[PDB]
Design goal:
Cathepsin D, subunit A, domain 1; 6-stranded mixed barrel; mainly beta; monomer
Length: about 325
């Protein structure tokens, strides 16, 4: 089997991407944030505190003939950005782009933090990291991808995120028409539950490439590119007037600037992030100070290849017995 779904930016800055997901019988379609940095499939639901719902589409398990309460199971998750959610658990039929899993754990939110409430366009998350991070207790549950894996033509999914435009998540096959040149594969460590890999270095604009190992995670659920402070300083030093602002919470730059590209290494290959991808616009409406898309990972504890980086590539998440990551230009 295979699946193929379109993923769409939630706003004009590509802050996140939503992908339609069918849950239950008859289908209830929710728009979920596919997140390769976590491993819970959770949804706004009929059980969510009413004051914490503001425009989201909710899953109503009582209206699904295939929904079954997973007796005794609860979940609770906190994310890197400080947001959180929790609730109880159903199993139900879940389909993504024609690919169907029966008995998928669907985690029903009773509580969500304000950040989720305020984002009316995101109805939940669909985790695509390794199932070892799944927070369901007392019986840990598998991700959609883990459940689908044995049925897939090939045990892979791919992320093809668009810049200010729709893109694609595919399951079970590699679309050889979706990228240019070759795919370069690189080793993955699952020791922390993430798609963790080591970049071979970087360049700023037309500058020389610096060979240096950068350990980080491929995370579709993080907006920006978070790298070591040395790297990030070298980038923003090439932008006149750029500075790190503690009051704003990162690097800002004059909105009149033209940003340089940023290149990262995948083995001997190179992925080029165009400068425009690094512009996240005015810090506040009407401001002439703009927020940078490359930020320091210092104090996160890990480097994160988020959407800013991933959308410059066709990315293969290979879930074979020995997982790997592949990157191609497109």
């Amino acid at each position: 089997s295979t699946g193929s779904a379109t993923t769409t930016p939630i706003d004009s800055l590509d802050d996140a991407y939503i992908t339609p997901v069918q849950i239950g019988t008859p289908a209830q379609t929710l728009n979920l944030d596919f997140d390769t940095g976590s491993s819970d499939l959770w949804v706004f639901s009929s059980e969510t505190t009413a004051s914490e719902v503001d425009g989201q589409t909710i899953y109503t398990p009582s209206k699904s003939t295939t929904a079954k309460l997973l007796s005794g199971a609860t979940w609770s998750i906190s994310y890197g950005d400080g947001s959180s959610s929790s609730g109880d658990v159903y199993t139900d039929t879940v389909s993504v782009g024609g690919l169907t899993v029966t008995g998928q754990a669907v985690e029903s939110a009773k509580k969500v933090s304000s950040s989720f409430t305020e984002d009316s366009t995101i109805d939940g998350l669909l985790g695509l990291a390794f199932s070892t991070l799944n927070t369901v207790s007392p019986t840990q549950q598998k991700t959609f991808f883990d459940n689908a894996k044995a049925s897939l033509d090939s045990p892979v999914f791919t992320a093809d995120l668009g810049y200010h435009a729709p893109g694609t998540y595919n399951f079970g096959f590699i679309d050889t028409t979706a990228y240019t040149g070759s795919i370069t594969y690189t080793a993955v460590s699952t020791k922390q539950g993430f798609w963790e890999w080591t970049s071979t270095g970087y360049a700023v604009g037309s500058g020389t490439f610096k060979s240096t190992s950068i350990d980080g995670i491929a995370d579709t659920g993080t907006t920006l590119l978070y790298l070591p402070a040395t790297v990030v300083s070298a980038y923003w030093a090439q932008v006149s007037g750029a500075k790190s602002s503690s009051s704003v919470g990162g690097y800002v730059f004059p909105c009149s600037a033209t940003l340089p590209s940023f290149t990262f290494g995948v083995g001997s290959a190179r992925i080029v992030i165009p400068g425009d991808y690094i512009d996240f616009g005015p810090i506040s409406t009407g401001s002439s100070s703009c927020f940078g898309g490359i930020q320091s990972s210092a104090g996160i504890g890990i480097n994160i290849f988020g959407d800013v980086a991933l959308k410059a590539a066709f990315v293969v998440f290979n879930g074979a017995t020995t997982p790997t990551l592949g990157f191609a230009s497109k």
